[PDB]
């Protein structure tokens, strides 16, 4: 409810409880409140913020996809009598999804991106901005779609530029960014050539430095496997 | 399949 | 604005929400459909039941996690406060379901199958309230669950065959009530064993459309009996 | 283990 007066440490503790309870909407709200306390986030805290909102929007995206498929199948069949209910319900889910994306983008703009000290956290938040514009782009139509795509591209490119200057090629944040930007190219921007070349370069450059911390090894190698899987799917 | 993006760690 | 949608459109949207795994929406649609004032079909009762059981199921699982953490901690105020918040939301949903059963669904008329189904559901949602209740209110809640289940049992024994899936599901849940809520393991085991045996004795008369469901409930009776003995 | 009640059909 009224989180402005709540102890920041209490909001983080409650976000962790909500995570254990698989209450991701609550978790997200707690982390929004924590962000709004106005301090920078730690690593753990970025992870909580990310997990919470990705679970919420993940659910909405999955539901949207089901409904869109039913809508399209219905319309294609073209029966004089079916279609209005699924359209309206798809629009309801879509509106809710857009609302969550707008919340995340608002927090990034109002609190997180400007206030980040270090390059690593700046890249993480710019990546997140790219991702939530990408989720808006999945459901956008027409001219709004073009603007949204441009916004995603701009955020990702800025992140990429920083990451190449400031972070090693095996850094999990740099890897996750490159993976997601390649997905943007393929799925959103209809640029398969760019997707494939970014994914291949990312994979190869990470492999070349793989011999250098065990603390990041599991995360980095998991992203490299997803790059490989995408490359197999795309070729 | 859809492409895979970065998961939850 | 559920009330501004036609009944057929509310049912259609409940089915869509089911496909999308959006159970809160599904429940809201089914509540609107109930409020149109027509009886529900079997299919439609199943939609209502699935929707609300999924919602409260999530709440119950979350409550159990938080309650466990709370109890381990006791062995700051945050876990109590958050457990209380989840608990209040769970009670809200149970109250919504119980309100609909009372205001619209439970009636003196209609076939025995639907009467027993709704009385069973009343017992279930009082049982979910009992899981979280502490104090004097707990005794009242337990009595309400018992009364609902017993009335359902009495109807089912007079009016329905022993292998009917609604009769079976009711007996299974009433046995769970005895074991987990009412501190009555002897009655739980006796009810489950009698239910199982009487159902198996008449299984050869059960229609094929009920076979899968009835056999699943009989398996759960067997598994509970193994757990309890 | 918790007792099992009737599942969703
Ligand atoms: C130290 C830190 O800043 N926090 C952990 C982050 C959350 C998730 N990101 S990510 O979205 O870039 C990502 C990379 C790799 C994997 I496996 C999952 C997510 C990384 C930093
Ligand atoms: C014809 C009918 O009234 N509808 C289907 C019902 C919904 C669920 N109930 S139940 O809660 O008693 C139940 C029985 C068996 C199983 I497997 C699951 C639930 C049955 C009737
Ligand atoms: Cl709708
Ligand atoms: Cl709380
Ligand atoms: Mg302080
Ligand atoms: Mg037709
Ligand atoms: Mg729209
Ligand atoms: Mg550096
Ligand atoms: Mg009407
Ligand atoms: Mg309470
Ligand atoms: Mg009378």
């Amino acid at each position: 409810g009224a989180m402005g007066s709540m102890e920041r440490a209490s909001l983080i503790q409650k976000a962790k409880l909500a995570e254990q309870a698989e209450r991701y909407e609550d978790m997200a709200a707690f982390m929004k409140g924590a962000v709004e306390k106005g301090e920078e986030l730690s690593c753990e805290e970025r992870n909580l913020l990310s997990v919470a909102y990705k679970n919420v929007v993940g659910g909405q995206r999955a539901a949207w996809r089901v409904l869109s498929s039913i809508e399209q199948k219905s319309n294609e069949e073209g029966s004089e009598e079916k279609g209005p209910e699924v359209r309206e319900y798809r629009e309801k889910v879509e509106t809710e999804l857009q609302g969550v994306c707008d919340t995340v983008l608002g927090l990034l703009d109002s609190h997180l991106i400007k206030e980040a000290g270090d390059a690593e956290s700046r890249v993480f938040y710019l990546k997140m901005k790219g991702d939530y514009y990408r989720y808006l782009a999945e459901v956008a139509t027409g001219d709004d779609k073009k603007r949204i795509i441009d916004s995603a591209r701009s955020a990702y490119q800025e992140a990429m530029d920083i990451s190449k200057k400031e972070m090693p090629p095996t850094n999990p944040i740099r890897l996750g960014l490159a993976l997601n930007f390649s997905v943007f190219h393929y799925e959103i921007a209809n640029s398969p050539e760019e997707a494939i070349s970014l994914a291949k370069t990312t994979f190869d450059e990470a492999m070349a430095d793989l011999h250098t911390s065990e603390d990041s090894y599991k995360d980095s190698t998991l992203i490299m496997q997803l790059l490989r899987d995408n490359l197999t799917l795309w070729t | 399949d859809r492409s895979s993006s970065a998961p939850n760690v």
Side-chain angles (χ1 to χ4, degrees), chain A, chain B:
Chain A
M3 298 196 177
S5 282
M6 299 290 192
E7 292 201 2
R8 189 183 186 282
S10 295
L11 297 168
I12 299 301
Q13 186 172 346
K14 290 188 188 186
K16 292 177 187 175
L17 293 165
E19 188 182 26
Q20 282 173 94
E22 300 183 55
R23 294 272 286 187
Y24 300 110
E25 288 183 20
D26 290 347
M27 190 189 175
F30 293 133
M31 289 307 304
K32 176 170 187 290
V35 170
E36 286 165 347
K37 296 300 288 180
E39 304 291 347
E40 280 182 84
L41 303 189
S42 72
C43 280
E44 179 185 41
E45 290 165 353
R46 283 184 281 285
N47 207 70
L48 292 169
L49 174 74
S50 189
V51 165
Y53 278 108
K54 186 174 188 19
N55 268 273
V56 175
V57 78
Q60 294 170 322
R61 295 173 60 206
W64 188 95
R65 292 171 185 171
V66 168
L67 294 171
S68 182
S69 174
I70 297 166
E71 183 183 9
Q72 290 176 247
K73 290 286 179 46
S74 180
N75 290 166
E76 171 200 52
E77 174 190 46
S79 305
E80 194 169 4
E81 88 275 350
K82 191 52 70 75
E85 292 81 355
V86 64
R87 177 182 176 89
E88 290 176 358
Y89 186 49
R90 186 269 298 154
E91 292 166 317
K92 174 184 197 292
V93 172
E94 186 170 304
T95 296
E96 294 186 24
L97 182 162
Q98 291 170 325
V100 172
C101 291
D102 287 347
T103 295
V104 172
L105 290 170
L107 282 173
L108 293 163
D109 195 64
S110 66
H111 291 88
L112 294 166
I113 290 169
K114 58 202 55 166
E115 292 175 341
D118 72 6
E120 185 178 301
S121 74
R122 194 179 316 118
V123 168
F124 171 77
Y125 295 125
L126 286 166
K127 173 187 162 301
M128 192 176 194
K129 178 170 183 173
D131 291 340
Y132 285 79
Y133 276 113
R134 175 160 57 85
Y135 310 144
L136 293 174
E138 289 177 343
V139 304
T141 55
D143 276 17
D144 191 46
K145 191 187 186 167
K146 299 196 295 282
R147 177 191 55 82
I148 291 169
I149 291 171
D150 288 346
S151 292
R153 185 182 287 105
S154 285
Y156 286 136
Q157 195 36 247
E158 189 173 353
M160 287 289 313
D161 289 326
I162 297 164
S163 81
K164 293 196 271 167
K165 283 148 171 156
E166 299 289 336
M167 282 147 67
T170 62
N171 178 283
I173 294 162
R174 178 168 165 179
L175 282 173
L177 162 66
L179 172 66
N180 289 6
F181 193 20
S182 76
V183 170
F184 169 83
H185 286 314
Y186 193 86
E187 294 288 347
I188 306 302
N190 204 54
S191 311
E193 289 189 45
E194 290 184 290
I196 293 165
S197 73
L198 176 57
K200 182 57 175 324
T201 297
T202 303
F203 180 90
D204 287 348
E205 290 184 347
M207 180 59 62
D209 290 1
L210 205 288
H211 69 108
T212 76
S213 88
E214 268 42 20
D215 182 38
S216 280
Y217 185 74
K218 276 171 209 152
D219 282 355
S220 297
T221 53
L222 174 55
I223 300 291
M224 289 174 78
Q225 185 63 53
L226 303 172
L227 289 164
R228 174 96 293 169
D229 298 343
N230 284 343
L231 281 165
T232 302
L233 177 69
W234 296 343
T235 67
Chain B
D1 301 8
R2 304 192 165 255
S3 308
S4 295
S5 63
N8 284 336
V9 36

